[PDB]
Amino acid sequence: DIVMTQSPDSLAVSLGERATINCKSSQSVLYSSNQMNYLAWYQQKPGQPPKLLIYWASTRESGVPDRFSGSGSGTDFTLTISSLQAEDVAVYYCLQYLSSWTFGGGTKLEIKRTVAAPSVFIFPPSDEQLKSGTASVVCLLNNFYPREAKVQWKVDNALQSGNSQESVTEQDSKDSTYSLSSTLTLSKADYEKHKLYACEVTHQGLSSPVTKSFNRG
Amino acid sequence: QVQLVQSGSELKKPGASVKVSCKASGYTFTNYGMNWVRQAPGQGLEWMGWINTYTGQPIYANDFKGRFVFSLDTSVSTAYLQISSLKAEDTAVYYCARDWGPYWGQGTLVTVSSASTKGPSVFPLAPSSGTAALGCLVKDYFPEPVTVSWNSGALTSGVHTFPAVLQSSGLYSLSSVVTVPSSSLGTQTYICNVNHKPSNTKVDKRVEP
């Protein structure tokens, strides 16, 4: 029954600026006897276990850079990244360990950078695929920011609904951009009933939309 | 020195049971308690409970009584998590985490599904027509995950591997791509190295204009 509540739930901060995450406990995690706060902070990147950054509220774990610090006491706590760096993109969790363990809900930290136009590319289905008889047309947006992007598929300039699935990479830890793959899927049949396959893209890094098309063979 | 090493991924059908192991080394096993932690895909960390590694006495969080049992084999310094009557929503990464300090397992993916192991099909996304993008499409594999490198991991710069998507077939699919100089295309070779361990499907497709 110690509830941990982190805020905000997600946060975008500019490279070089101060990132601040808050954790609040529903009861004190300060142990009277030893004046220690039983609170830790963790950084989790995808595919990995969480990695401990801070414990006893303010003690920095070995090997962790000086830009991370923890402070606060009792029931209110702060994690501070003094000067954010591209590699800091991650989910951050507080943990109380005074009375059992309770993790906070986690805080997704992203980097805020300058607008960046996507590089659009289109890729027709392979011959090898079409033999088994399905068509996967792949549109790729590459190295844009921000995340927001629209991808409309056009077959003979007929707008497509319900047959494309999108997917977005995590923010890249070196240059702070996203990439987005859209796949249009059709039976071999339907792919033969049409000619011009196009994907049209909308963004803020574009005064007007960008198309890439091919003609079926 | 200190290491917590867990067992490998598991695909289970609803109703069955599973037994994840966590083998500790580099310290006196029985001097430190062991925690279990569950992370459902895309979700937060959630404490499952603790085991006293000296007495064997397990303590369970409120949300994990009934189907969950913690046990030890002190003689090989190993903690075990046993989940019974598996449901789809027990699909999660499970972690062992030691009392006091930074030590976590690498985690064990448990997937609960009726569907069968099925290896992908790999398909090039060849370049054509400054910079030219090329890639691979990895289609109709189950379950997650798959890995991808470029040129046995010589080309990592510029690489972007995409999160899988679940298609309405109930099979996964994903693309991996990379942008290169458009002069390099004739001269330089590009191979995407694809691995799906659940079905042993390992593939080194070449990609050319």
Author numbering:
A (entry chain B): 1 to 217
B (entry chain A): 1 to 129, 135 to 214
Study authors write:
Here, we developed a pH-responsive anti-polyethylene glycol (PEG) × anti-TfR bispecific antibody (pH-PEG engagerTfR) that can complex with PEGylated nanomedicine at physiological pH to trigger TfR-mediated transcytosis in the brain microvascular endothelial cells, while rapidly dissociating from PEGylated nanomedicine at acidic endosomes for efficient release of PEGylated nanomedicine to cross the BBB.
To engineer the pH-responsive PEG engagers, we determined the cocrystal structure of humanized anti-PEG 6.3 Fab (h6.3) in complex with PEG. We hypothesized that the conditional disruption of the formation of the h6.3 Fab homodimer/PEG complex under low pH conditions may decrease its PEG-binding activity in a pH-dependent manner. The pH-responsive protein interactions typically rely on the presence of ionizable amino acids at the binding interface. The protonation of ionizable amino acids at low pH conditions could induce intramolecular electrostatic attraction, repulsion, or hydrogen bond formation, leading to decreased or increased binding activity at different pH conditions. Several h6.3 Fab variants displayed pH-dependent PEG-binding activity. Finally, the h6.3 Fab variants that produced an absorbance reading higher than 1.0 unit at pH 7.4, while decreasing more than 25% in PEG-binding activity at pH 5.8 (Clone 6, 9, 10, 11, and 12), were combined to generate the pH-PEG engager. By contrast, the pH-PEG engager could strongly bind to PEG-coated plates at pH 7.4, while its PEG-binding activity decreased at pH 5.8, demonstrating that the pH-PEG engager exhibits pH-responsive PEG-binding activity.
